[PDB]
Design a protein around this nucleic acid. Structure first.
Ligand SMILES: NC[C@@H]1O[C@H](O[C@H]2[C@@H](O)[C@H](O[C@@H]3[C@@H](O)[C@H](N)C[C@H](N)[C@H]3O[C@H]3O[C@H](CO)[C@@H](O)[C@H](O)[C@H]3N)O[C@@H]2CO)[C@H](N)[C@@H](O)[C@@H]1O
Ligand SMILES: [Mg+2]
Ligand SMILES: [Mg+2]
Ligand SMILES: [Mg+2]
Ligand SMILES: [Mg+2]
Ligand SMILES: [Mg+2]
Ligand SMILES: [Mg+2]
Ligand SMILES: [Mg+2]
Ligand SMILES: [Mg+2]
Ligand SMILES: [Mg+2]
Ligand SMILES: [Mg+2]
Ligand SMILES: [Mg+2]
Ligand SMILES: [Mg+2]
Ligand SMILES: [Mg+2]
Ligand SMILES: [Mg+2]
Ligand SMILES: [Mg+2]
Ligand SMILES: [Mg+2]
Ligand SMILES: [Mg+2]
Ligand SMILES: [Mg+2]
Ligand SMILES: [Mg+2]
Ligand SMILES: [Mg+2]
Ligand SMILES: [Mg+2]
Ligand SMILES: [Mg+2]
Ligand SMILES: [Mg+2]
Ligand SMILES: [Mg+2]
Ligand SMILES: [Mg+2]
Ligand SMILES: [Mg+2]
Ligand SMILES: [Mg+2]
Ligand SMILES: [Mg+2]
Ligand SMILES: [Mg+2]
Ligand SMILES: [Mg+2]
Ligand SMILES: [Mg+2]
Ligand SMILES: [Mg+2]
Ligand SMILES: [Mg+2]
Ligand SMILES: [Mg+2]
Ligand SMILES: [Mg+2]
Ligand SMILES: [Mg+2]
Ligand SMILES: [Mg+2]
Ligand SMILES: [Mg+2]
Ligand SMILES: [Mg+2]
Ligand SMILES: [Mg+2]
Ligand SMILES: [Mg+2]
Ligand SMILES: [Mg+2]
Ligand SMILES: [Mg+2]
Ligand SMILES: [Mg+2]
Ligand SMILES: [Mg+2]
Ligand SMILES: [Mg+2]
Ligand SMILES: [Mg+2]
Ligand SMILES: [Mg+2]
Ligand SMILES: [Mg+2]
Ligand SMILES: [Mg+2]
Ligand SMILES: [Mg+2]
Ligand SMILES: [Mg+2]
Ligand SMILES: [Mg+2]
Ligand SMILES: [Mg+2]
Ligand SMILES: [Mg+2]
Ligand SMILES: [Mg+2]
Ligand SMILES: [Mg+2]
Ligand SMILES: [Mg+2]
Ligand SMILES: [Mg+2]
Ligand SMILES: [Mg+2]
Ligand SMILES: [Mg+2]
Ligand SMILES: [Mg+2]
Ligand SMILES: [Mg+2]
Ligand SMILES: [Mg+2]
Ligand SMILES: [Mg+2]
Ligand SMILES: [Mg+2]
Ligand SMILES: [Mg+2]
Ligand SMILES: [Mg+2]
Ligand SMILES: [Mg+2]
Ligand SMILES: [Mg+2]
Ligand SMILES: [Mg+2]
Ligand SMILES: [Mg+2]
Ligand SMILES: [Mg+2]
Ligand SMILES: [Mg+2]
Ligand SMILES: [Mg+2]
Ligand SMILES: [Mg+2]
Ligand SMILES: [Mg+2]
Ligand SMILES: [Mg+2]
Ligand SMILES: [Mg+2]
Ligand SMILES: [Mg+2]
Ligand SMILES: [Mg+2]
Ligand SMILES: [Mg+2]
Ligand SMILES: [Mg+2]
Ligand SMILES: [Mg+2]
Ligand SMILES: [Mg+2]
Ligand SMILES: [Mg+2]
Ligand SMILES: [Mg+2]
Ligand SMILES: [Mg+2]
Ligand SMILES: [Mg+2]
Ligand SMILES: [Mg+2]
Ligand SMILES: [Mg+2]
Ligand SMILES: [Mg+2]
Ligand SMILES: [Mg+2]
Ligand SMILES: [Mg+2]
Ligand SMILES: [Mg+2]
Ligand SMILES: [Mg+2]
Ligand SMILES: [Mg+2]
Ligand SMILES: [Mg+2]
Ligand SMILES: [Mg+2]
Ligand SMILES: [Mg+2]
Ligand SMILES: [Mg+2]
Ligand SMILES: [Mg+2]
Ligand SMILES: [Mg+2]
Ligand SMILES: [Mg+2]
Ligand SMILES: [Mg+2]
Ligand SMILES: [Mg+2]
Ligand SMILES: [Mg+2]
Ligand SMILES: [Mg+2]
Ligand SMILES: [Mg+2]
Ligand SMILES: [Mg+2]
Ligand SMILES: [Mg+2]
Ligand SMILES: [Mg+2]
Lengths: 272, 49
RNA sequence: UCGAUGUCGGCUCGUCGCAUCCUGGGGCUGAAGAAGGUCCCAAGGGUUGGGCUGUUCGCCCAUUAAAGCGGCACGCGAGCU
RNA sequence: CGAAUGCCGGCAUGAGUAACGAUAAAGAGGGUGAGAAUCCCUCUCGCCGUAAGCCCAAGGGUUCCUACGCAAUGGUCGUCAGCGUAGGGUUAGGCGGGACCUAAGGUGAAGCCGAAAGGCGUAGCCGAAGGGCAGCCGGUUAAUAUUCCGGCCCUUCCCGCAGGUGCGAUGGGGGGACGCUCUAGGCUAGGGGGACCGGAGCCAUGGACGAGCCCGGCCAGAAGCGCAGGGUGGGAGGUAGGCAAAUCCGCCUCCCAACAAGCUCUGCGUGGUGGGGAAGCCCGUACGGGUGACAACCCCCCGAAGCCAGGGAGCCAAGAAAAGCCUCUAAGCACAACCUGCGGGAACCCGUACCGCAAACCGACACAGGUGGGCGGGUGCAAGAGCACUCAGGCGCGCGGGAGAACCCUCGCCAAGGAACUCUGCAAGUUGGCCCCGUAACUUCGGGAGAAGGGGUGCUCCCUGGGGUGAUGAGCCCCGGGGAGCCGCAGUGAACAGGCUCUGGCGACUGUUUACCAAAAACACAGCUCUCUGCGAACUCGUAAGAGGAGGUAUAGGGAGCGACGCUUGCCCGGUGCCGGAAGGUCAAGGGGAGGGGUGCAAGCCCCGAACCGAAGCCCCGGUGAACGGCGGCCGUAACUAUAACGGUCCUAAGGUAGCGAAAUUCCUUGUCGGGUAAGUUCCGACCUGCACGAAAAGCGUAACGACCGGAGCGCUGUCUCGGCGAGGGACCCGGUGAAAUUGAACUGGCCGUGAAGAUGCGGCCUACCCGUGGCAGGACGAAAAGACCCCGUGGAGCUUUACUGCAGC
RNA sequence: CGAGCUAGCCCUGGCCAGGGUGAAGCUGGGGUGAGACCCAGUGGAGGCCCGAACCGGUGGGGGAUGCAAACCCCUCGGAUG
RNA sequence: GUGGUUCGUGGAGCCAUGGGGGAAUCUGGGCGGACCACCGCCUAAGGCUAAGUACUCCGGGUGACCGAUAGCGCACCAGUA
RNA sequence: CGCGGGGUGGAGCAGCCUGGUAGCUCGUCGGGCUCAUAACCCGAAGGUCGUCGGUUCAAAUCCGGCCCCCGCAACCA
RNA sequence: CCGAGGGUAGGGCCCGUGACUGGGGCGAAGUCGUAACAAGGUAGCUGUACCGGAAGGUGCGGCUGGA
RNA sequence: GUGGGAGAGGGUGGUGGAAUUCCCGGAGUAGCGGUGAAAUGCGCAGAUACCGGGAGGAACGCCGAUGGCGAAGGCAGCCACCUGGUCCACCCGUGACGCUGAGGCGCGAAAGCGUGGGGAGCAAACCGGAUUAGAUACCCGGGUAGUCCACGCCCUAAACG
């Protein structure tokens, strides 16, 4: 989708909005299973650690289910599909037959009315979740766990997905939304299908405000400020850095790798 | 234009208050000295009810 | 002169020098006459409006008897800009 | 002690000088009084009136009221006061806050960390203009009143009796509970009219005894109705979820309604009754009291942004918590307990005065400044919180009186010319609201646009079409149309209310910034690219714990640059950076002991020390430019000259492409042609010999947009020729209060000299009676600031880096 | 010792008169094979327009031992973000 | 690896000690400034201990100390206005 | 005016700093192949080294004086 | 009221002229190279796309007007 | 109409092996590459050659044809679904309902363009190596867009029988 606009105001011409057709006549969220008071704040205890944040629409947290072995075997019916301000993926709310309700990040396909479930059993269909081993090599899938019982963590962004590649001992090779081939443990669930609402990468914010709404204040270039507060700074009319591009704190930012070398997680990785 | 003193009872006891100064090691010393110097008033005289 | 003598230009106000632009006398003129050239006498008064430039100076434009040159802290900011 | 722009204290100079703090404005009469422009009262005049009026909150802390008083405080006076002295004055279960709840945040048992101090911190506590919670209208004081009195009306509590029920938690579930813009229905606040009712009263000056003028025609109000409206489906089975248990909720299934029919719950009417009640007139105030009065207390229309409210619709940026509240069960308890009546008893602590856009708060001041929420009447102008006048109400700003110079400020107008003014049309002008005709290039199809340019606007009369409210009608209120005629110089008749265009530069746009000289072409901005990050992420703060990132997960987060969009962003990896290199070279601690030394009679004990094994880093090998950057020189040739497609040659890592180019870049420079001008160092179009453009420190363009910067034309003009007159506030004089910087001392002229080379002071000569007041600014190298420039000092700081040396970090 | 000025953010409330413009979307009409799409009407969007409060602080004049240690008059920017 | 002692790595001991190693109970152990032999000296890895020393908010005494711009900041209703 | 770089056969460049020895590419001349010209092949010629001085036995080379040439600086006022 | 004509404002087409500029035609014997016609010595021609002093070269698809 | 026929006609979905390049493991050495010849380039850091495993993209060998299909452009491994044209037999149905067709309208190779995904091979531009008087060319080694998919544009051709 992606709503468009006629130019009746510069900016609201290039501006592009999402299409909330996929939003089952829902909107008002569900008390109980979410929401919780969401403590918004751009800095830690005192100081501001991440810069340029703050401001932007008030938000309510939708406490989603990111570990599904909670209900192994208990099937549930997908009730609605709603908007979640805390993420890029739309989310689906679903009523188990157990009578319990919980939200799930909504996969592309999954339609309201559908029945979905989790566990070793589970049929390989959009929405169902199973330990990685029991999933057919090659099938795509989202909401992966990295270590058994620790909760989903990979491919959860709007319309992202990972593809299974092979098996190898108690591990199974994956291919993350980034292109890295990772070795994940067999016992990590991963609900099947891709995340959906993949038009998300196409929304043209539009104006200055639009960014402000999502809570992101203006970002000033180092080049603008002085030597006192950033490498690229001063002196006359503009100027070409004058040294290898660096961050406010001073480490190179055009090429310098960061992953800490001797990490134990190294051996389970294979790509880029 | 607007100036720098905008009186506020709450802020004043809340900041230069007595329990306020007792709470920290630096403030307790603030008291010591003032006590040791004589000062009729150890801390500002906030008021009302 | 640094326990400060504010500086270019313009504006307002001027005053002075003459090695005189004009006008007034005058000698020679390769000065017929008319107009000039040149030096000598002589500052008493007169010495325009503009276009361009911050401009001083120029360059033009339209005239003029003429569109003089300099000093006065490159006269004048306890007078202005 | 004569000196230190010395320290402190005092008194002088300037000076009876400048001033006396908004040009909203004052005159008189009568009091009082030792003493009145300044106090009290009356009349007349002026000013505010989306405040200059009243209601709150904050802050202030007696400033309130009353008696007596002016020493000082008051920019003058003072009989006055926010001033001095005394006394009095602030009443609450219902308004506010606490014996209620939670927000960010604070604290903090537990737990974690830190040399110490201390940092963190899920439970709980704390934390409020947010949630919850029961008062409306009148009467009284000199000063308090949602507080006291009066009338109506509520709230918990504890104890009783009367009756119902499984009662019962700090625990479960429900609810509380939420955005933004736009909104409907019906009410209320408030407001306009009335030939109707109520009233003292009034015929003025030519006319009016009139359905005349003037005044006023409500307020609260339980139950019950009534009109609005907000909420909510009733069953019955099944249950493995809501970290126990639930009959509750939730989910599944079968029914009956889908309606608000029914239950609620608000609001608004109405309601027993309870109040209030003008103008005028009479008095005596420093004010309020009588009468008007058995006052009337009725009908229309306008009508909210306020109420019904948890109403509706649309949108994306997706919109606190917890208690109270209803329900649920558990432990216990069911002679308890809880719910509904009805009685009776109990209902504590703190605020209330007064100022409150200000002479009482923040600005040293009775300061032209700052100050948060509510109300803010009428008419008229298209609307409105706008503007002009005016209700209520509060004011004439705590120095006056005259004068009528120059000059200044604010204001008005002007013959002819009209930008000749000037750095610049700086300034001022013309223009001006609404209605209707009417509008170009260009364009991203929206815009350009209020383009430009026009016309209409008043009042009277006739005819005439639509709403709203009432009934399908009168009226009252809204929008209109057509047609005759009237008056002025002129009809948005006063007040508020764009000058227009052409064309360049820069920036796309709204935005932002140097509070207190810079608002821009700077920052920002969507958007484009590089890059880091696999999640106990990178990154940041922290010694740590810890947190932020993020309750996020590559469509995401950090860093960097460019900065909408259009069309594009070329070559060089030699040097620096970063990326990839299980080789080799170098490479510390450590391993290793060849070999050597010192003592010992000695066994021994103590040292040196070569092979070789030895990380990262460096070296070397590769790549990488939206990484740091760089992107040449000289000679010759075309059948007129010229000029060079072509060629030779030297050195590059390569040797600037397109596009633009006298530029925000051009030195020589007013380069040279062209355009605009009577004239053009600027401007616009070109040419290119680009001192010294050039592609994301982006390149060339770009519709729209800008208090940005440049040029031009029209319009208009006191900008100018070239001034002139008028106005008011000062200046001037009189009365009252009365500063200041400065000051070695002064009995302080001109000239030509001279002097440390710019003399009132020394020389000579010239001039010149003594002392003032309004003015002018040429001098006292005038005043002001131990020059901000320059240099000096082995002075000091901020900044940079392949300067040195350390450190955090890795 | 200071965030009672100022800067930013966190929590919780308040304010923004009145007039313009008229996006999408609905509705109907045309249109096709069905479309697109063109019209009307409706609709009430927007870092949209004029403009008060309110927030600014553009130009000029005043002020300069001031009313004021940043003010006053005229003028001007924004004013549903 | 550092601190202490006059000892700044010096031939650098002795005394403390963060890190690694890691004994012994008299024929055991540390020391006498690298070391070794000799000669001696002392007996680590637990604790307590007046006194003579320091200070003077406070009491008293004395001054080739001040005498109200001195002396305490305060002679005085001053850590006040 | 000041700083440093440079004048070499016809053209463009080496040659010095460690003095004795002028080298390269092109071009020019003679000869070949071709019908002929170019290309290509075979041979050959050409340099007071900017000039006036001396330094040494000996100067392109070292050192001073001028003649042009090129690039860099001309700041604070 | 109508109204010749005049005035002011803005448009529509047309023609003249304009520094400079873009290709073009024509102009007996100037420079540069070989593109084409013989397999033209790289079959050509081609739509498009980029690049190059110039003919032109090259990718991609195509056609016989070629093997 | 009825009953049949062939087909690379069209769209979506799914899939098969061969080859390639790249990575890993193995074993293996002193050269591979390329050419007219060469060099560039690659390779003891261990290439090429060969085995094994994996990744990924595109294009479908023999069948295969001088063949079929389509209105053109064009269409090729295989499976299904959705669907278009057309041929035949039967002569049963309607009963002249026809041919063309300004315009409109749709379709329209390759290259190109917009946004996004994909990237093995090849390959404008580009860089090097030789050829050459000179080579911005024909030969070689690297190599970017592109070639590939989705939607949207483009509308040209020796769209030629
Ligand atoms: N009329 C010729 C057109 O123009 C071009 O050709 C023009 C030029 O290229 C051409 O120039 C030629 C040159 O090519 C050739 N190699 C040498 C010749 N001397 C020149 O000649 C030219 O100049 C001379 C003298 O002035 C004239 O007399 C002659 O007419 C003219 N062609 O002259 C032509 C004009 O006459 C196109 N190449 C050609 O295809 C086209 O048809
Ligand atoms: Mg803290
Ligand atoms: Mg930025
Ligand atoms: Mg800066
Ligand atoms: Mg820095
Ligand atoms: Mg820099
Ligand atoms: Mg610069
Ligand atoms: Mg000086
Ligand atoms: Mg002086
Ligand atoms: Mg004469
Ligand atoms: Mg003169
Ligand atoms: Mg001079
Ligand atoms: Mg001069
Ligand atoms: Mg001067
Ligand atoms: Mg001055
Ligand atoms: Mg002395
Ligand atoms: Mg005086
Ligand atoms: Mg005077
Ligand atoms: Mg005076
Ligand atoms: Mg008092
Ligand atoms: Mg009083
Ligand atoms: Mg007085
Ligand atoms: Mg005063
Ligand atoms: Mg008296
Ligand atoms: Mg609490
Ligand atoms: Mg509260
Ligand atoms: Mg209350
Ligand atoms: Mg009162
Ligand atoms: Mg119960
Ligand atoms: Mg409960
Ligand atoms: Mg609860
Ligand atoms: Mg009469
Ligand atoms: Mg009257
Ligand atoms: Mg009532
Ligand atoms: Mg609602
Ligand atoms: Mg809640
Ligand atoms: Mg609680
Ligand atoms: Mg109590
Ligand atoms: Mg009170
Ligand atoms: Mg009160
Ligand atoms: Mg006053
Ligand atoms: Mg305000
Ligand atoms: Mg009102
Ligand atoms: Mg007003
Ligand atoms: Mg005039
Ligand atoms: Mg006139
Ligand atoms: Mg002029
Ligand atoms: Mg002039
Ligand atoms: Mg100008
Ligand atoms: Mg102006
Ligand atoms: Mg302009
Ligand atoms: Mg402009
Ligand atoms: Mg801008
Ligand atoms: Mg500001
Ligand atoms: Mg400023
Ligand atoms: Mg300013
Ligand atoms: Mg990023
Ligand atoms: Mg911190
Ligand atoms: Mg963390
Ligand atoms: Mg978190
Ligand atoms: Mg920029
Ligand atoms: Mg580039
Ligand atoms: Mg490099
Ligand atoms: Mg490079
Ligand atoms: Mg390199
Ligand atoms: Mg190493
Ligand atoms: Mg020019
Ligand atoms: Mg330049
Ligand atoms: Mg530039
Ligand atoms: Mg760049
Ligand atoms: Mg730019
Ligand atoms: Mg440009
Ligand atoms: Mg702006
Ligand atoms: Mg501005
Ligand atoms: Mg004047
Ligand atoms: Mg006057
Ligand atoms: Mg003198
Ligand atoms: Mg004298
Ligand atoms: Mg003077
Ligand atoms: Mg004066
Ligand atoms: Mg002075
Ligand atoms: Mg000095
Ligand atoms: Mg200077
Ligand atoms: Mg020194
Ligand atoms: Mg519409
Ligand atoms: Mg609107
Ligand atoms: Mg706006
Ligand atoms: Mg506005
Ligand atoms: Mg030491
Ligand atoms: Mg020892
Ligand atoms: Mg010893
Ligand atoms: Mg001893
Ligand atoms: Mg002891
Ligand atoms: Mg004293
Ligand atoms: Mg003292
Ligand atoms: Mg022409
Ligand atoms: Mg023309
Ligand atoms: Mg021409
Ligand atoms: Mg040829
Ligand atoms: Mg060819
Ligand atoms: Mg072609
Ligand atoms: Mg090429
Ligand atoms: Mg038949
Ligand atoms: Mg046909
Ligand atoms: Mg294609
Ligand atoms: Mg792409
Ligand atoms: Mg590749
Ligand atoms: Mg290749
Ligand atoms: Mg190639
Ligand atoms: Mg050749
Ligand atoms: Mg096509
Ligand atoms: Mg064409
Ligand atoms: Mg054909």
């Amino acid at each position: 989708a992606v709503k468009k606009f006629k130019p009746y105001t510069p900016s609201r011409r290039f501006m592009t909005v999402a299409d909330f057709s996929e939003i089952t006549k829902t909107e008002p969220e569900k008390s109980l299973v979410k929401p919780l008071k969401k403590t918004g704040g751009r800095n830690n205890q005192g100081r501001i650690t991440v810069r340029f944040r703050g401001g932007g629409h008030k938000r309510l947290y939708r406490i989603i289910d990111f570990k599904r072995w909670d209900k192994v075997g208990i099937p549930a019916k997908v009730a609605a599909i709603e908007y979640d301000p805390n993420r890029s993926a739309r989310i689906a709310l679903l009523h188990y037959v157990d009578g319990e309700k919980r939200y799930i990040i909504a996969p592309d396909g999954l339609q309201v009315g559908q029945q979905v479930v989790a566990g070793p059993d589970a049929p390989i269909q959009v929405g169902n979740a199973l330990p990685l081993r029991f999933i057919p090599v090659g099938t795509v899938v989202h909401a992966v766990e990295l270590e058994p019982k620790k909760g989903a963590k990979l491919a959860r962004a709007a319309g992202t997905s990972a593809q299974i590649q092979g098996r190898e001992g108690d591990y199974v090779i994956l291919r993350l939304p980034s292109g890295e081939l990772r070795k994940v443990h067999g016992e990590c669930y991963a609900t099947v299908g891709a995340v959906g609402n993949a038009d998300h990468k196409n929304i043209v914010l539009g104006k200055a405000g639009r960014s402000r709404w999502l809570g992101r204040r203006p970002h000033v270039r180092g080049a603008a400020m002085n030597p006192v507060d950033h490498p690229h700074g001063g002196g006359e009319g503009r100027a070409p850095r004058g040294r290898p591009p660096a961050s406010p704190w001073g480490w190179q930012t055009k090429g310098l790798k960061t992953r800490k070398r001797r990490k134990p997680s190294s051996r389970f990785i294979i790509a880029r | 234009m607007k100036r720098t003193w905008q009186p506020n009872r709450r802020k004043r006891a809340k900041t230069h208050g007595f329990r306020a100064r007792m709470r920290t090691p630096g403030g307790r010393k603030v008291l010591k000295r003032r006590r040791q110097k004589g000062r009729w008033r150890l801390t500002p005289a906030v008021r009302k009810r």
